[PDB]
Amino acid sequence: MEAKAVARTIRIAPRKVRLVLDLIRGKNAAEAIAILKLTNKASSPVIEKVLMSALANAEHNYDMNTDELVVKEAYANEGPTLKRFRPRAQGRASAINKRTSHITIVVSDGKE
Amino acid sequence: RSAVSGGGRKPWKQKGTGRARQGTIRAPQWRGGGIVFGPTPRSYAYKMPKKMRRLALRSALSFKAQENGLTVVDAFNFEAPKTKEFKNVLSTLEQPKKVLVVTENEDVNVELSARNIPGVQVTTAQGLNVLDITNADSLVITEAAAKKVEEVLG
Amino acid sequence: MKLHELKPAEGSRKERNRVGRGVATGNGKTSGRGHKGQKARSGGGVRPG
Amino acid sequence: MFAIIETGGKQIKVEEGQEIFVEKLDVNEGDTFTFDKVLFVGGDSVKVGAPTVEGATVTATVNKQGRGKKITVFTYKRRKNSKRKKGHRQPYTKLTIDKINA
Amino acid sequence: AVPKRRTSKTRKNKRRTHFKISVPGMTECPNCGEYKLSHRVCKNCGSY
Amino acid sequence: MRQTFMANESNIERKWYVIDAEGQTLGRLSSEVASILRGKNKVTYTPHVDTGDYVIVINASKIEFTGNKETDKVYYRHSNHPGGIKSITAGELRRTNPERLIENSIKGMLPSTRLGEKQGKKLFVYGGAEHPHAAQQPENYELRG
Amino acid sequence: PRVKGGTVTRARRKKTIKLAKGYFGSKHTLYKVAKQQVMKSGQYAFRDRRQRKRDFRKLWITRINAAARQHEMSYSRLMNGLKKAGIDINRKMLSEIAISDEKAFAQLVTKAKDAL
RNA sequence: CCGAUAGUGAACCAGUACCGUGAGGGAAAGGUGAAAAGCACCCCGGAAGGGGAGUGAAAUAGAACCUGAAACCGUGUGCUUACAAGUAGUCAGAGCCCGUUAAUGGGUGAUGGCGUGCCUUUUGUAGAAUGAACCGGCGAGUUACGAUUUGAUGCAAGGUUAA
RNA sequence: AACUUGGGAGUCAGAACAUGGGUGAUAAGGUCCGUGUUCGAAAGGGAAACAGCCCAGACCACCAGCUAAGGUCCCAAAAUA
RNA sequence: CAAUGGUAGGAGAGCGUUCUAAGGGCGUUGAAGCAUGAUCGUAAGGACAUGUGGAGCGCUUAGAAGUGAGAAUGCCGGUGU
Ligand SMILES: [Mg+2]
Ligand SMILES: [Mg+2]
Ligand SMILES: [Mg+2]
Ligand SMILES: [Mg+2]
């Protein structure tokens, strides 16, 4: 009835990935895959990998048909940012956050 | 702030940086250095007048004598240290769990016979003290020890 | 008396006054020293006489 | 069938079968109280008492002598280190009217 | 030149209500059945 | 919090009233009208709901002013532009757009709350004997002396 | 012996945060502004528990005035006449009688009118 | 006496990373589990990650590993909101949801009244005077010796010992 | 109430109003004294808002009553007395 | 019957925290912590229930203090705008 897939500590800022993740929430699996393959954002292939992993988990572990499957929920929450610096003028150093994301996709057949 | 290692230079200039003025890295507000008013080594013992000490001993013993917590025995005559025999002696005397046994002088065999019984402590007539008497629920004193205590304590 | 029920003599003990701990004690901010001048400074005040 | 009683320092409009909440009275739970200060009776026949009506007792059954919900009185002056906090719980009596007399 | 106060969470989430991307302008490919960009070649098949 | 009645929309009954402005002074009619559509003549008045009645003022070209505030008594207004203030005397408002005159006079006597604006919306002023509100079945209302 | 400040700061701050439940944004989450708002709320509630009695008195007054002017009689004259007649019904009870039993309130109006 | 911001600067390869030409200055960083039994095999994926299966008492104990607060970031919703002027609450209140340490109950809230934060410093501060981005931790009348006073307790023309 | 003996303080920047005066210009929300009040350290009602003006001193409830200063056509309680 | 605004400031009574003494207790049939709740007291604050957690901790009386933070352009960390 439900299948899960998580990609942890993806080196893309969660604010950037949630833009693409907003497009596939609640959509059909086929439409979600097409959206991901056709939108030109850096986060699309990464989300596509998690989607395909969730679909494979569905098929292989629970034996549900991947034609009646909807993207039950799709979200990204923050991971362990990396702290870097940039040398600015006059000897000062400014912080740079290289943020990471935990991307979760669960697909469902919408039944019980 | 003097005993903490290092921290002898002014961390930054007094004016112009936009930061709070600081004078040492080991000031009490800083992490890692400077306790303001901490414990110091000292003694906690004080003195009470001599008559007050003897009045306290007499009051402890009188309290232990009005609660029927004073048992007088004739002698002990333990010829070898044996804990089991002293335990039987105490049980036959019907004594509470906590008991203070008092001998005339240092009876080595009684001392050794009662070291390992929990809640039984051995002492001499001159070694009596208020904390030990008040701890014990009962006193088992030898007649000679009783007479010696009566002589000493007025 | 017993070692678990011991009582000091009435009127012999008194809790000391801790200063500079909240304003409900009455000695909170300025700690009983008023506002400014020597008397408010640590080690302030003047030589007796 | 509709009366005005004076109790506490207030007046309450009552009719039989009603539950009222008054300032604490000196009765026990499950006793009967009689209000003898009735200023007005309504319904089909109207008796307008000058002070009271004269007669017109109202009997009630007393249940749940209690204390109200806790108020937390707090006050503070602005830049003066002055504030006060204290709780309060008003005692009350719950009664149920069972007879309007006249 | 410099912010005078914080930006509250409410104000921030109000400002970024129009910060979003639209779904691609995509259509099913007549020859192969997979989705493609309208007026673009189907990358799965290569037609039209 | 014992037993005070509070009116709500499930028991408020608003009625319709016509008030003739023929031979009546601006402020003295306006204050009574404001009282009516505030709902203060109702025994069931409640300050947080719009109890109160709709009012039609029909003649409103026959309203009079005491003194000589026809030529004095100038209404000013600003456009929020620099130097953007202009004025019209009360007499000119009476001869051109007398409905606005009475509307503004009554509106100034209502609170500037949301309820106040909603209550002022219950006022219909016409500068002539007739009104189009016959389907609402209004009753004539005489001003208190 | 040392005592570190564990598990008293949290409890005290938390029971103020819980007391600021329902406030806007920062005022139900951050201790520093929640405390100020709970303080201001305590002050406001203290003042308004007194303001309430005068607000409800004036409500009852307005209702009695409206009920009395239906009998061509002002609130002032009605209250003066009821005093003359010795009637000691509060403004609250007067308003409720006017709302509920119109006939009884008319009777009170007449008994205050004949006390002229 | 301290229990990882404490206790040594250093519980850990510490006078070490690092800074300086040099004297010198000087960190941060403890905890899986009883046992490594540290996830055989299958699946998506180049990998990283994951979902199963299995080990284990426990796997949101999976190696960044005991507990896991707050700030902060998300995803769902019950109630509200696009004619309104707001130190954001408080008092009054319908409607709509819900049902508790069962007691004149919980959530939200049309609309009405009242209402210019807190500290410091001031004659006087909403102040356009100071201070705080937020959250957490830490962070300021102590101890020794003497003096004086008050309470207590012994003894009393006597009281008390210091080394 | 007052006084005496002792332990502990804080304060030594004051303000406005009214009134008797100096100074200034029968100027200042000026400055310096005498006298009273209030603020300071005082919430509440009135004076639109408004430390110092007028009324009045908040132990805590109440959806009771009587008044002060100010008020009673509508905002806004009470006289279109 | 009377009193109970309050700043510098004086006085009194208390609430909590760590440790120690003695007594009496609770804990893998689940301690402390953490979370939530519509609970109790005049305040500081005290319980109860249910989740999380997985080995320690209350109560009484009495002793000691590194005993209580919202502000120091505070210090260290984390995280925002
Ligand atoms: Mg350079
Ligand atoms: Mg400021
Ligand atoms: Mg500003
Ligand atoms: Mg600042």
PDB file of N, CA and C in Angstrom, chain F residues 9-40:
ATOM      1  N   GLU F   9     -27.089  37.382  14.829  1.00  0.00           N
ATOM      2  CA  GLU F   9     -27.798  37.460  13.557  1.00  0.00           C
ATOM      3  C   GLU F   9     -28.968  36.500  13.463  1.00  0.00           C
ATOM      4  N   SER F  10     -29.053  35.507  14.339  1.00  0.00           N
ATOM      5  CA  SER F  10     -30.163  34.573  14.306  1.00  0.00           C
ATOM      6  C   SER F  10     -31.417  35.102  14.988  1.00  0.00           C
ATOM      7  N   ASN F  11     -31.352  36.257  15.659  1.00  0.00           N
ATOM      8  CA  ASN F  11     -32.540  36.831  16.277  1.00  0.00           C
ATOM      9  C   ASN F  11     -32.655  38.337  16.069  1.00  0.00           C
ATOM     10  N   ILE F  12     -31.826  38.932  15.226  1.00  0.00           N
ATOM     11  CA  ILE F  12     -31.957  40.344  14.886  1.00  0.00           C
ATOM     12  C   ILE F  12     -32.958  40.481  13.752  1.00  0.00           C
ATOM     13  N   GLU F  13     -33.936  41.363  13.931  1.00  0.00           N
ATOM     14  CA  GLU F  13     -34.919  41.671  12.901  1.00  0.00           C
ATOM     15  C   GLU F  13     -34.818  43.146  12.557  1.00  0.00           C
ATOM     16  N   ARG F  14     -34.283  43.443  11.383  1.00  0.00           N
ATOM     17  CA  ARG F  14     -34.144  44.810  10.920  1.00  0.00           C
ATOM     18  C   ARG F  14     -35.361  45.197  10.097  1.00  0.00           C
ATOM     19  N   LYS F  15     -35.844  46.410  10.314  1.00  0.00           N
ATOM     20  CA  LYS F  15     -36.966  46.953   9.574  1.00  0.00           C
ATOM     21  C   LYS F  15     -36.515  48.148   8.749  1.00  0.00           C
ATOM     22  N   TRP F  16     -37.444  48.674   7.961  1.00  0.00           N
ATOM     23  CA  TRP F  16     -37.171  49.773   7.052  1.00  0.00           C
ATOM     24  C   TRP F  16     -38.005  50.984   7.436  1.00  0.00           C
ATOM     25  N   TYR F  17     -37.393  52.160   7.355  1.00  0.00           N
ATOM     26  CA  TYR F  17     -38.030  53.399   7.771  1.00  0.00           C
ATOM     27  C   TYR F  17     -37.790  54.462   6.716  1.00  0.00           C
ATOM     28  N   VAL F  18     -38.806  55.273   6.454  1.00  0.00           N
ATOM     29  CA  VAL F  18     -38.657  56.472   5.643  1.00  0.00           C
ATOM     30  C   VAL F  18     -38.700  57.670   6.569  1.00  0.00           C
ATOM     31  N   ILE F  19     -37.788  58.608   6.363  1.00  0.00           N
ATOM     32  CA  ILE F  19     -37.751  59.838   7.133  1.00  0.00           C
ATOM     33  C   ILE F  19     -37.789  60.988   6.146  1.00  0.00           C
ATOM     34  N   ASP F  20     -38.774  61.861   6.300  1.00  0.00           N
ATOM     35  CA  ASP F  20     -38.867  63.036   5.455  1.00  0.00           C
ATOM     36  C   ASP F  20     -37.950  64.143   5.958  1.00  0.00           C
ATOM     37  N   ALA F  21     -37.107  64.644   5.058  1.00  0.00           N
ATOM     38  CA  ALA F  21     -36.189  65.724   5.373  1.00  0.00           C
ATOM     39  C   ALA F  21     -36.771  67.100   5.102  1.00  0.00           C
ATOM     40  N   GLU F  22     -38.025  67.184   4.664  1.00  0.00           N
ATOM     41  CA  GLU F  22     -38.678  68.464   4.441  1.00  0.00           C
ATOM     42  C   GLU F  22     -38.817  69.234   5.746  1.00  0.00           C
ATOM     43  N   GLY F  23     -38.286  70.451   5.782  1.00  0.00           N
ATOM     44  CA  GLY F  23     -38.434  71.301   6.945  1.00  0.00           C
ATOM     45  C   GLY F  23     -37.740  70.782   8.187  1.00  0.00           C
ATOM     46  N   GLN F  24     -36.521  70.272   8.035  1.00  0.00           N
ATOM     47  CA  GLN F  24     -35.772  69.747   9.170  1.00  0.00           C
ATOM     48  C   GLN F  24     -34.332  70.211   9.059  1.00  0.00           C
ATOM     49  N   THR F  25     -33.693  70.431  10.201  1.00  0.00           N
ATOM     50  CA  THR F  25     -32.321  70.910  10.204  1.00  0.00           C
ATOM     51  C   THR F  25     -31.354  69.743  10.040  1.00  0.00           C
ATOM     52  N   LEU F  26     -30.257  70.004   9.325  1.00  0.00           N
ATOM     53  CA  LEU F  26     -29.279  68.972   8.990  1.00  0.00           C
ATOM     54  C   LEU F  26     -28.875  68.150  10.210  1.00  0.00           C
ATOM     55  N   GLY F  27     -28.265  68.800  11.200  1.00  0.00           N
ATOM     56  CA  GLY F  27     -27.680  68.061  12.305  1.00  0.00           C
ATOM     57  C   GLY F  27     -28.702  67.362  13.174  1.00  0.00           C
ATOM     58  N   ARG F  28     -29.854  67.992  13.383  1.00  0.00           N
ATOM     59  CA  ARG F  28     -30.851  67.432  14.282  1.00  0.00           C
ATOM     60  C   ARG F  28     -31.561  66.222  13.699  1.00  0.00           C
ATOM     61  N   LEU F  29     -31.789  66.182  12.391  1.00  0.00           N
ATOM     62  CA  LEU F  29     -32.227  64.952  11.746  1.00  0.00           C
ATOM     63  C   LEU F  29     -31.119  63.912  11.711  1.00  0.00           C
ATOM     64  N   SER F  30     -29.893  64.350  11.415  1.00  0.00           N
ATOM     65  CA  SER F  30     -28.786  63.418  11.251  1.00  0.00           C
ATOM     66  C   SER F  30     -28.502  62.650  12.531  1.00  0.00           C
ATOM     67  N   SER F  31     -28.543  63.322  13.680  1.00  0.00           N
ATOM     68  CA  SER F  31     -28.232  62.648  14.936  1.00  0.00           C
ATOM     69  C   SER F  31     -29.266  61.576  15.269  1.00  0.00           C
ATOM     70  N   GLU F  32     -30.550  61.870  15.052  1.00  0.00           N
ATOM     71  CA  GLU F  32     -31.581  60.866  15.298  1.00  0.00           C
ATOM     72  C   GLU F  32     -31.472  59.700  14.327  1.00  0.00           C
ATOM     73  N   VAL F  33     -31.180  59.989  13.059  1.00  0.00           N
ATOM     74  CA  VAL F  33     -31.018  58.919  12.081  1.00  0.00           C
ATOM     75  C   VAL F  33     -29.846  58.025  12.464  1.00  0.00           C
ATOM     76  N   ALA F  34     -28.735  58.636  12.876  1.00  0.00           N
ATOM     77  CA  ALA F  34     -27.585  57.860  13.312  1.00  0.00           C
ATOM     78  C   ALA F  34     -27.954  56.982  14.491  1.00  0.00           C
ATOM     79  N   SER F  35     -28.747  57.512  15.418  1.00  0.00           N
ATOM     80  CA  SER F  35     -29.199  56.692  16.533  1.00  0.00           C
ATOM     81  C   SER F  35     -30.017  55.503  16.052  1.00  0.00           C
ATOM     82  N   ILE F  36     -30.883  55.712  15.059  1.00  0.00           N
ATOM     83  CA  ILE F  36     -31.731  54.619  14.575  1.00  0.00           C
ATOM     84  C   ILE F  36     -30.883  53.520  13.950  1.00  0.00           C
ATOM     85  N   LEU F  37     -29.991  53.894  13.033  1.00  0.00           N
ATOM     86  CA  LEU F  37     -29.278  52.844  12.316  1.00  0.00           C
ATOM     87  C   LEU F  37     -28.088  52.301  13.098  1.00  0.00           C
ATOM     88  N   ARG F  38     -27.709  52.933  14.209  1.00  0.00           N
ATOM     89  CA  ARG F  38     -26.845  52.257  15.172  1.00  0.00           C
ATOM     90  C   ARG F  38     -27.595  51.159  15.907  1.00  0.00           C
ATOM     91  N   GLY F  39     -28.911  51.277  16.011  1.00  0.00           N
ATOM     92  CA  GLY F  39     -29.689  50.323  16.766  1.00  0.00           C
ATOM     93  C   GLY F  39     -29.901  50.675  18.214  1.00  0.00           C
ATOM     94  N   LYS F  40     -29.758  51.941  18.580  1.00  0.00           N
ATOM     95  CA  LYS F  40     -29.822  52.314  19.982  1.00  0.00           C
ATOM     96  C   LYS F  40     -31.237  52.502  20.497  1.00  0.00           C
TER      97      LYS F  40
END
